[PDB]
Every structure is written in C-alpha cells, then in structure tokens.
Design a protein around this nucleic acid. Structure first.
Ligand SMILES: CNc1ccccc1C(=O)O[C@H]1[C@@H](O)[C@H](n2cnc3c(=O)[nH]c(N)nc32)O[C@@H]1COP(=O)(O)OP(=O)(O)NP(=O)(O)O
Ligand SMILES: [Zn+2]
Length: 323
RNA sequence: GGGAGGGCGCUUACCACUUUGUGAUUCAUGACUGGGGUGAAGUCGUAACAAGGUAACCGUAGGGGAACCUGCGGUUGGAU
C-alpha cells in the first residue's frame, strides 16, 4: 500500500476511465464497450453489477481497484459482447467517486464505508424483544454527520398490544417531537406500508437495523420476488433494489449500526437541539456533567431535555475511549 | 440258409446355449449430503501466540446460531 505510489496510480486509473469512454474500438477485443453500473453484490472476489440496460452481470475486479463495495455505481465492462451471453461474464474496469455513502465502525480493523450514494438511511428496528434508544441515538448522529436523511421505522408492531403499544409509540414520540421521520409497521403484518412506500418514492436510500429488527421483513415486504427467506429465527454486502424505487444495501452487518469515534467537539453538533443547549454554560470548557451552573444539565433535569438522551449521549463519549 | 460285422437308428453318459431362483460385482440415474479449495466483505464477536488479555492442551460429557460454551479427568506442550 503506498500513498505515493497509490497517488500517481490514482491519476492513471482515473484517466483510464475517461480515456476508455473517449471511444471504443482501440480498447477492444477481449472485452466489450464500457458502461455504467452500480454494485449490487459483493463476491469477495467478484461483484454483481446492474448495468444501464438493467441486467446484472457478475464481474471480476481488476487489482487496479483499491477496493469496492455495495452501493457503488460507476463504469464497468463485461467480457466482450459474446461472453455475457453464455454465462454472466464481466469485469469492473474502474469505479466512480462515491458522492454519498457511509462506513462501519470496527476495533482492530478500521472504518469501512458500507455503501455509497444514499439519499436516506432508514433505521430498523423491532419491538421484539426489546428496543434500546441508545442504538438509535448513536445512529441519529451518523445520519447528521454524513448529511444523510434518517427514517426510524418501529416495525413488527403487530406484535404489540394494549399495554404493549401504548408504551411503544409514545416512547418513540421523541422522534416525532424533534422532527424525525418514523412509520410503525409489521412486516409479518404489512401495516403502515403505505406511508413508507411513498417516503421511498423517488429517493436513493437504504434500511439498516440492530440485531433482529425485522430488516428482512420490510425489504421483503415492499418488494419480494423469488426470495423470501431472510427472516426466520434469530440470525444474520448486497444492496437490493426497491419496488417503488431506491435501493438498500443489505449485507449481513450494516443493520447492526455500531458507533465509531469521529471527533470530540462533533458529539456536541450531533444533535441540532444542542444548538440551544451549548449557548451559555457555567464553565467555558464545561463538558456538561457535574459543573456548577451548566446549561445542558439545567435543561435536562428541567423537563425539556430527555434524560434518556443525556445518559446515551454521555455514554457515547465514554464508549470511544474504550479502545 | 446265411453269418460275424458295420452303417443307418433310438437311447444312455459328459456337456455347449440358455430360462427359474438366488443372489454376488460393478457401470451408470438420480430425491439427499457430509465436508474440502479458494479470497480485494458484514458481522457477530476477541479466538490461538504476551499474563494474548476466560493459562494452554489432551480425553469425554451435557450445552450453545457463529467462532466457541461447560461439566468431568488428565497434563506442563502457561506471564509474575
Ligand atoms: O424471524 C425473522 C422475522 O420473521 C421477523 N420479522 C420481520 N418482520 C417482522 C414483523 O413485522 N413482525 C414480526 N413479528 N416479525 C418480523 O424478524 C426476524 C428478522 O427478520 P429478517 O428479515 O431476517 O431481519 P434483518 O434482515 O433486518 N436481519 P439482518 O440485518 O441480520 O439480515
Ligand atoms: Zn455544560
């Protein structure tokens, strides 16, 4: 890996794209004309790419590609013309600059963008067995930081009841109070599937939830053809296409939105609400904890700031230094 | 006169082909699979080598979606 050699190399790969696009036959013979595509499936060593034509091609990925991931739309080739026609045979000559995308946190292994070109990131979730706002709280900051739109969807609502929902919806009202988008539904039950469908209308976004939040239900509910197995018990990079438009990078991980450490002054910018809680405090450097005359504290224990949000926000900062 | 004798002849014995059984051996066919070979992922995890960050390892039990867990016995192939 060579930042320098990597650099000079970058320019080369870039030119290769524009140069190849200039026009074809000089390129030719083994492979066919270049075309655009996005990465639906990751074969570790291969990738399924959907072409402009709309037909997916499993392709090789020339070493010259530092990396690739799902949600990556860009130029591509298959082998020849003839070669795609017997058996999905294609190769990815180069990629495009991911306009909108996000990565996963990790521990040893470094942050890796999960998907690119995202208009909205709908946080799944599920009532079974029990939610944890924390997971959603940390996710809220991510959506703000990548400047992506967030949709929280309390799913599997059909599983709740009298003393079950009256505590679910309300408890989630927080999102409806601070201006967030949410739509209670139950894949098993197909309820509130109208609102979501419209929300996903003309947009490029995807859904990720925590361990077992009904991600397979919703993705399989909106549009499911010859493939409805991704439920079933409690268990587990392909970005599937939508029934009403939009795609959703599903890989068995993403739904488990962890939490990575970006900066120590950003955490305060995570929530817009803080725009009024970070005005005047007791200590110029008051981390908002046990200071005398704080602002965020005087608001929390005052009824305006949701206590639950305080504990979660404070825990997030203590989670980073966990390294 | 003929006669012995022989052939023709039938039949007997051995038995070739081959049908009933009875199976034995392989070729294939295929409902169905263990578990192998690969790596430019996600996780969900911190597993082995440090005291590696549930000493390790061995037998075997029960247990557990995932590496693993654990009872039981054993050891020195475990930092101080
Ligand atoms: O059992 C299955 C479901 O039957 C059930 N399930 C899904 N939707 C619903 C629902 O609406 N209601 C109920 N009761 N169960 C549901 O919830 C479980 C999870 O469904 P999955 O589709 O696999 O969820 P992910 O795809 O998000 N998971 P990963 O990110 O790891 O791929
Ligand atoms: Zn303060």
């Amino acid at each position: 890996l060579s930042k320098g050699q990597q650099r000079r190399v970058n320019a080369n790969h870039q030119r290769r794209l524009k140069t190849s696009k200039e026009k074809p036959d000089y390129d030719d013979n083994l492979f066919g004309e270049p075309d655009e595509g996005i990465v639906i499936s990751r074969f570790g060593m291969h990738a399924d790419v959907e072409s402009a034509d709309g037909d997916v091609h499993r392709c090789n990925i020339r070493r010259t590609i530092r990396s690739l991931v799902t949600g990556d739309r860009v130029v591509w080739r298959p082998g020849k013309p003839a070669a795609e026609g017997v058996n999905v045979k294609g190769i990815v000559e180069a990629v495009h600059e991911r306009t909108s995308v996000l990565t996963r946190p990790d521990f040893y292994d470094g942050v890796k963008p999960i998907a690119a070109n995202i208009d909205q990131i709908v946080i799944v979730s599920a009532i079974l067995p029990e939610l944890s706002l924390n997971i959603i709280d940390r996710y809220l900051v991510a959506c703000e930081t990548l400047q992506i739109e967030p949709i929280i969807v309390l799913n599997k609502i059909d599983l709740l009841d009298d003393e079950g929902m009256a505590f679910v919806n309300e408890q989630m009202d927080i999102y409806r109070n601070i201006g967030y988008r949410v739509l209670m539904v139950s894949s098993h039950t197909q309820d509130g599937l109208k609102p979501l469908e419209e929300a996903l209308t003309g947009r490029i976004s995807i859904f990720a939830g925590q361990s077992g939040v009904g991600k397979s239900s919703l993705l399989n509910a909106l549009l499911g053809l010859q493939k409805e197995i991704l439920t079933n018990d409690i268990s587990d990079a392909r970005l599937y296409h939508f029934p009403h438009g939009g795609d959703v990078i599903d890989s068995p991980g993403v739904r488990e939105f962890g939490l990575w450490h970006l900066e120590p002054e950003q955490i305060t910018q995570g929530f817009v609400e803080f725009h009024d809680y970070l005005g005047l405090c007791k200590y110029r450097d008051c981390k908002h904890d046990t200071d005398p005359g704080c602002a965020i504290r005087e608001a929390v224990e005052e009824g305006k700031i949701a206590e639950t949000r305080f504990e979660n926000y404070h825990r997030i900062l203590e989670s980073m230094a966990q390294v």
